[PDB]
Amino acid sequence: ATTYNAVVSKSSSDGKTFKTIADAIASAPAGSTPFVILIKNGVYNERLTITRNNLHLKGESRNGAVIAAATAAGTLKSDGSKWGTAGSSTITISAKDFSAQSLTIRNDFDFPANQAKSDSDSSKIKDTQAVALYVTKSGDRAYFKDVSLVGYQDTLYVSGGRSFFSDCRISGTVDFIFGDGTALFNNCDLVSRYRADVKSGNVSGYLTAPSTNINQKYGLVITNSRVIRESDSVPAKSYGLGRPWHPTTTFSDGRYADPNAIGQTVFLNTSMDNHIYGWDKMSGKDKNGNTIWFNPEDSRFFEYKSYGAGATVSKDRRQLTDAQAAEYTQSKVLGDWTPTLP
Ligand SMILES: COC(=O)[C@H]1O[C@H](O[C@@H]2[C@H](O)[C@@H](O)[C@@H](O[C@@H]3[C@H](O)[C@@H](O)[C@@H](O[C@@H]4[C@H](O)[C@@H](O)[C@@H](O[C@@H]5[C@H](O)[C@@H](O)[C@@H](O[C@@H]6[C@H](O)[C@@H](O)[C@@H](O)O[C@@H]6C(=O)O)O[C@@H]5C(=O)O)O[C@@H]4C(=O)O)O[C@@H]3C(=O)O)O[C@@H]2C(=O)O)[C@H](O)[C@@H](O)[C@H]1O
Numbered sequence: 001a002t003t004y005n006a007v008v009s010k011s012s013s014d015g016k017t018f019k020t021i022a023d024a025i026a027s028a029p030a031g032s033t034p035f036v037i038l039i040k041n042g043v044y045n046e047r048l049t050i051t052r053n054n055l056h057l058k059g060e061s062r063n064g065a066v067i068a069a070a071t072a073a074g075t076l077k078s079d080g081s082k083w084g085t086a087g088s089s090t091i092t093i094s095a096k097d098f099s100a101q102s103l104t105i106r107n108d109f110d111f112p113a114n115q116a117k118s119d120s121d122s123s124k125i126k127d128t129q130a131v132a133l134y135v136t137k138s139g140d141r142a143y144f145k146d147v148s149l150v151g152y153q154d155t156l157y158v159s160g161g162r163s164f165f166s167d168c169r170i171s172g173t174v175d176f177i178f179g180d181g182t183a184l185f186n187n188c189d190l191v192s193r194y195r196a197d198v199k200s201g202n203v204s205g206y207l208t209a210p211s212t213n214i215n216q217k218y219g220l221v222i223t224n225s226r227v228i229r230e231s232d233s234v235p236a237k238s239y240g241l242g243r244p245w246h247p248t249t250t251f252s253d254g255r256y257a258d259p260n261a262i263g264q265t266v267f268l269n270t271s272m273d274n275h276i277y278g279w280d281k282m283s284g285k286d287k288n289g290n291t292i293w294f295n296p297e298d299s300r301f302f303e304y305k306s307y308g309a310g311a312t313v314s315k316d317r318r319q320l321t322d323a324q325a326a327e328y329t330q331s332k333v334l335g336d337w338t339p340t341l342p
Pocket residue numbers: 073084085086087128129153154174175178203209245246247248249282283284
């Protein structure tokens with residue numbers, strides 16, 4: 001038995017339906033009883049912030065039910081200030097027990113068109129991060145099943161608590177899954193995108209940029225998935241599995257790269273095409289304002305039984321033992337939370 005509290009559709013011929021997703025979400029009574037919204041096929045040009053607990057979105061189809069907006073970090077607001085990376089997100093989850101099923105979420109910022117602009121073009125944006133989905137510190141127990149996330153730089157921003165992505169597609173270029181959250185991915189296609197603006201022999205991107213606090217047990221955990229290239233034009237050895245993001249953070253002694261954000265990315269039983277070269281380093285600014293490099297060997301970067309042409313085993317690519325791999329089951333990673341749909 002499954003029923004819908006609200007329905008969103010493009011057609012007025014449907015009857016008693018909402019025109020926008022934002023309106024349907026707003027219609028929900030205040031509180032924490034489950035609220036389930038069906039979204040019929042269509043492209044909904046909307047930006048959403050979810051603050052109600054126990055809210056659930058179900059699209060008619062992943063292929064056809066799309067929530068999309070174009071916003072880069074460097075896009076300017078009315079007051080002339082930048083949106084910033086967090087602010088660029090098409091969908092922001094700032095509530096508990098959210099789920100989305102069978103829908104696509106896009107940031108439509110045209111990264112390649114931006115990069116193709118002449119350097120003197122005042123409309124050419126430097127802050128090119130453009131988040132599709134952001135799970136915030138106030139997000140915990142967020143479940144995404146049969147969902148497609150589309151972007152280039154910084155597609156998926158996972159912060160705070162636990163999120164679970166299942167039967168999913170996620171595309172991007174630089175740091176397209178990033179943040180300090182506990183985020184588990186199962187049976188997902190992670191799609192590395194072509195970079196027209198990157199010279200032959202240089203790096204096109206990085207799948208992950210975890211900022212997991214050293215005291216947090218689990219960061220980004222990718223299981224039973226497929227690490228694939230968008231096209232044959234994506235060069236061999238052009239993509240890193242991860243680099244360590246140490247976010248600029250305000251401390252008592254100033255604002256600089258967080259020393260204790262020693263990120264975790266673990267791949268288990270995941271296929272990898274030959275666009276993958278391994279792990280990489282990442283730079284930030286230290287407490288003195290100097291460049292500081294954070295190295296993959298000092299970070300929590302591991303694989304277990306990778307396969308496909310990108311799955312090389314070497315001293316630069318640490319491997320889990322069977323015993324260690326058993327620590328990365330859904331039960332262990334998500335703890336007392338069992339992701340369920342309404
Ligand atoms: C409640 O939340 C909060 O606590 C805060 O939220 C807000 O802040 C967040 C965040 O917490 C904060 O640290 C800060 O994050 C920024 C940035 O927004 C974020 O996306 C990320 O950025 C990294 C990196 O630091 C950037 O320099 C940039 O990477 C560049 C380049 O863009 C990229 O293409 C690539 O480059 C290629 C090669 O790798 C390179 O060697 C060279 O050859 O160039 C190549 C090229 O093609 O350009 O890597 C570059 C690089 O490594 O520098 O983008 C990455 C990324 O996308 O992940 O981290 C920074 C940071 O400062 O750490 O701001 C966030 C925000 O939302 O704005 C609030 O502001 C805060 O007050 C607080 O509330």
